[PDB]
Amino acid sequence: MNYTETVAYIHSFPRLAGDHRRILTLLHALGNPQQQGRYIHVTGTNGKGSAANAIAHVLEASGLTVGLYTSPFIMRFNERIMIDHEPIPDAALVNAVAFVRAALERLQQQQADFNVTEFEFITALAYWYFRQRQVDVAVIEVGDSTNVITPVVSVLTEVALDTITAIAKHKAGIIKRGIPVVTGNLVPDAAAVVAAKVATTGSQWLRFDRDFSVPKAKLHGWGQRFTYEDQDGRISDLEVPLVGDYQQRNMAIAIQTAKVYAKQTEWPLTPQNIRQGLAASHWPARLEKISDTPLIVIDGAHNPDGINGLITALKQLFSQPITVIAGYAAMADRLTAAFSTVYLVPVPGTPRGRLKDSWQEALAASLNDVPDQPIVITGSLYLASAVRQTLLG
Numbered sequence: 182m183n184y185t186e187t188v189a190y191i192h193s194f195p196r197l198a199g200d201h202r203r204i205l206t207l208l209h210a211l212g213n214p215q216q217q218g219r220y221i222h223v224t225g226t227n228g229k230g231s232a233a234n235a236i237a238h239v240l241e242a243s244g245l246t247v248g249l250y251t252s253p254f255i256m257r258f259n260e261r262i263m264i265d266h267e268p269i270p271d272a273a274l275v276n277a278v279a280f281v282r283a284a285l286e287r288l289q290q291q292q293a294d295f296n297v298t299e300f301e302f303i304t305a306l307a308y309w310y311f312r313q314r315q316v317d318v319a320v321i322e323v324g325d326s327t328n329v330i331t332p333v334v335s336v337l338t339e340v341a342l343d344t345i346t347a348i349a350k351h352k353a354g355i356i357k358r359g360i361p362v363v364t365g366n367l368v369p370d371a372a373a374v375v376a377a378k379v380a381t382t383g384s385q386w387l388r389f390d391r392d393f394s395v396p397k398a399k400l401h402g403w404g405q406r407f408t409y410e411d412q413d414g415r416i417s418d419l420e421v422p423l424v425g426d427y428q429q430r431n432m433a434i435a436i437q438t439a440k441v442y443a444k445q446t447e448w449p450l451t452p453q454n455i456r457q458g459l460a461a462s463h464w465p466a467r468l469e470k471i472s473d474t475p476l477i478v479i480d481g482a483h484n485p486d487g488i489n490g491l492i493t494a495l496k497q498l499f500s501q502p503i504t505v506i507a508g509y510a511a512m513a514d515r516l517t518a519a520f521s522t523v524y525l526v527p528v529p530g531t532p533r534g535r536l537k538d539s540w541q542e543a544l545a546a547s548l549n550d551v552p553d554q555p556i557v558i559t560g561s562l563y564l565a566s567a568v569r570q571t572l573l574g
């Protein structure tokens with residue numbers, strides 16, 4: 182096939198019904214690449230994509246070839262599988278999809294009704310591609326079809342209040358015997374689930390605000406300047422180009438995890454690597470300022486927690502009036518009460534306050550009416566990625 186037939190073939194996979202048998206059957210046909218190499222396992226309800234990207238950036242700056250498996254993509258499909266922050270080239274995706282389909286067709290010649298899902302096909306391809314390219318470590322963000330590895334260190338960023346013990350027990354399945362777990366400051370029910378699991382596995386548990394912390398943090402331009410502290414000391418005046426107070430805990434989790442990786446593998450990691458790797462830690466479409474003149478910021482906050490955390494982040498950055506373009510009525514009532522011009526438009530991959538029929542009509546209106554006013558586009562990551570693909574791709 183071509184690339185276009187290859188990405189359409191990946192999306193043609195079904196919606197099957199538990200354990201990891203189907204993906205392990207497929208992975209045995211690929212020669213078990215999940216059993217070789219080093220891995221960092223990342224799960225959590227929020228902040229896992231941001232942490233994983235930060236861990237990868239810090240490890241790459243120390244001189245390691247880092248594979249990175251994330252979801253979702255923002256600009257193109259190829260962003261889900263990266264090696265040193267470069268998305269898997271089209272032709273390499275064409276080759277890899279052809280190799281995995283060939284092994285899958287061999288498996289269907291034996292077991293006639295064998296199949297896998299879309300995420301299981303992608304995860305198996307990701308794990309085979311990282312071994313083919315021979316990376317030093319692969320940072321794996323949890324989708325659990327990825328739970329077929331023994332990591333060097335596991336990360337559990339958050340189990341947020343949105344049942345808690347039932348969610349925490351599903352998330353604690355990535356914690357393995359003797360392998361250290363780096364977590365955030367978990368809520369009581371999630372913490373009790375983590376404490377009992379690590380007493381069972383015998384794991385070293387490094388927790389945010391206990392073993393490591395951020396004693397100083399403040400805004401500095403479009404990003405934050407902060408100080409990290411642990412048992413080895415402090416690394417002061419670290420800078421990341423990400424706004425939001427919740428990002429202080431994701432970066433701190435990322436720094437602690439990277440240090441736990443290097444100590445376990447006897448790899449040298451300096452504070453310089455951590456500093457340089459945190460400076461390169463850009464995470465697209467998450468309060469990203471994409472244009473200076475005119476001022477345009479894109480964001481994918483989609484819950485009311487995301488709307489409330491955005492509102493105070495926008496208040497921190499802007500003391501002038503802005504136009505906010507929003508992709509239900511409780512999310513829109515807090516936007517109208519806090520901001521100037523507010524436009525409600527439709528999100529592009531969905532179906533059926535000032536109303537606009539599209540985000541382009543709202544953006545053209547604001548630029549025509551008041552050209553010096555900043556525009557923030559928020560409400561969905563799919564709407565935010567549509568604006569980013571249009572305005573930059």
Ligand SMILES: [Mg+2]
Pocket residue numbers: 229230231251252253322
């Ligand atoms: Mg993510």
